[PDB]
Ligand binder design. Sequence first.
Ligand code: NI
Length: 341
Amino acid sequence: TCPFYKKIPGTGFTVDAFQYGVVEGCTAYFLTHFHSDHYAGLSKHFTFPVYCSEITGNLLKNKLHVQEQYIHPLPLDTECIVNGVKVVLLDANHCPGAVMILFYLPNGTVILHTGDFRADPSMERSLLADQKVHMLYLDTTYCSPEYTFPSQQEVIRFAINTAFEAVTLNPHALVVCGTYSIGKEKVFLAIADVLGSKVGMSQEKYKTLQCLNIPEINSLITTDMCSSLVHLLPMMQINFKGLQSHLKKCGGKYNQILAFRPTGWTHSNKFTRIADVIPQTKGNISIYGIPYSEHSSYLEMKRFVQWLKPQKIIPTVNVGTWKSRSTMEKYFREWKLEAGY
Ligand code: NI
């Protein structure tokens, strides 16, 4: 059944609750972003209203073929009324089109649902600062002090310099980037840009990026693989077997592949710096795992919550075990006691 943490009390609303059939009493289904755990259930045969950002709406329409009459895109940073309830959609600093949602309940309660986010000090100067939030439904993906990672800017600086060096030493080297969803577009765009290339990809993936309102996007991407030295492949293909195979397909235009696997966290984060990353190598093929996160680090989460000072926190990730629930609740109390709310 639809879990309680997908339900917004005092409303007929659910958030990211598309795989439970008709939910008894739901008058509007919110979708925070276009990742498949969150949209799972949606199709052309859906006949309830879906509320979402303009970008999420383009993807529902063109990728999932949801009929245009059931898609209700809202603008960000604007007070809107939906079935009698004031709502605002805010940038979540996750993948493109991803949002957080502020609900103003008729009774005076204010609720913030983060969807998936990477907390940032910039959110402390959004509409959030203007009034008190009583309940917070929180992306807790990385709620444990081991989870540190570098800034997205630091990671991108790394990738740009790595690629530029390898290609300038060997102009017959190919750069490959792994992907299995929207998100983490900066990696392949920032590399392609230092190299004076467009990014080459499949037709389905080109379709997906054309949904995202990226400025001057036409200048940056293509389906013509052969004119391009930064290729996107499915993440499943980012390995020695899969890259050797792919290297063959280019017909001796390339003699070396350098590949990037954007990961979330991996346990080398506990010991190693970004400056000190190294690849796995078999022959003329090297693979880098780079920790580009679009979720909050522990410290970024902590800071957001201590700034917001909510009355109750409801986690939306890692909820399925008693051990994880218990651990999260402990850190929430630590934060509350340290910041005196
Ligand atoms: Ni997500």
